[PDB]
């Protein structure tokens, strides 16, 4: 069974180690999986777990629509769910 | 098949509202539940999710098997599972 979260047949596995966005994307591609989509998890209960975690859009997943746009975030490192 | 983490039957439900230890225990008991035990989660993946969350022993869960006890956890507030 899934070793993490589950929601309509999508099993989310956490990777505790901090890594950049491109590193997260490469590691996710290695395990034949993709990073979470913000729209897929915005209204659901998974958000509390996914907060401050990388998303496919290239920015951290934040519940509030407000975001600190125009700020370079590529240099940051955060946990990723896949 | 619950809205949380499943391990060996027991289901863990996250509460994102910061509460003290006594309040966390009261809420968990009101929901017919008890706070997680350190022994069951120390050696399992669940730790990565329940780190810095309250436990039954009255201290935040920490990966270290043996650590100095601050004993001032009375005034601290952290999220809880149950």
């Amino acid at each position, epitope marked *: 069974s899934c070793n993490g979260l589950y929601y309509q047949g999508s099993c989310y596995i*956490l990777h505790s180690d*901090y890594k950049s966005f491109e590193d997260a994307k490469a590691n996710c591609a290695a395990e034949s999986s993709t990073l979470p989509n913000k729209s897929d998890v915005l209204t659901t209960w998974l958000i509390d777990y996914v907060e401050d975690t990388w998303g496919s859009d290239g920015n951290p997943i934040t519940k509030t629509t407000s975001d600190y746009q125009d700020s370079d975030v590529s240099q940051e490192v955060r946990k990723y769910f896949c | 098949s619950c809205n949380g983490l499943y391990y060996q039957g027991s289901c863990y439900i996250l509460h994102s509202d910061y509460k003290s230890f006594e309040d966390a225990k009261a809420n968990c008991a009101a929901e017919s539940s008890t706070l997680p035990n350190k022994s069951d989660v120390l050696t399992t993946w669940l730790i990565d999710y329940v780190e*810095d*969350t309250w436990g039954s022993d009255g201290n935040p869960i920490t990966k270290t098997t043996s650590d100095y006890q601050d004993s001032d*956890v009375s*005034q601290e507030v952290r999220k809880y599972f149950c």
Partner: antibody
Amino acid sequence: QLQLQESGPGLVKPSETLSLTCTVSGGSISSNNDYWGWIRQPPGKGLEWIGSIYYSGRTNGNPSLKSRVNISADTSKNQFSLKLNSVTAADTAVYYCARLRLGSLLHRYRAVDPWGQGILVAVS
Amino acid sequence: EIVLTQSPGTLSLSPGERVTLSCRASQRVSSTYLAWYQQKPGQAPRLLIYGASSRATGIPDRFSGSGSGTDFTLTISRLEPEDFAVYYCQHFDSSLLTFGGGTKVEI
């Protein structure tokens, strides 16, 4: 109980390389939730962040010193070290080895709680 | 990039009053990143507030924090003799770390 202790010389010569090593007792440098960094305070002035390191090997440093900072980590001996080349008289300061906490997934702790005693380094 | 400026370099206060120390950011910075530290002479800094509102372990209830955006404040209701020290405001985001100039509490 996590204590950080610094060891190294205090007589670095101009145009040479410093060698400071910080060792941690009561914990393991292999901590997914924390970085380990060096912060220098010149005597009677404000703090300055001279670098950080992750157990994997990733290095982050302040751009003004990015050219001269080569931080290293050794997990087996549980020691993290700083090397500063092309030293100049303005670098004299008290150096602290600290733990830059990032926090767990649910608890976010963005601060450096544990600091070392600090080691004073000057120049000839 | 991000620079934190503490306008009041030094403050004069007698014991027992309430003191508010202000830290400003060049650009908007989220609350969770900000922190407030205290440093006595000849000792390493000790964490006072993290997240701008959370007291660290062992910090008395006198210290408290508030603010948002480009202005944050650390308020000490009662100034005991120990509270007289330098106070720093720090920005950390898992990347470049920045420290404030510092404000000294004397009489």
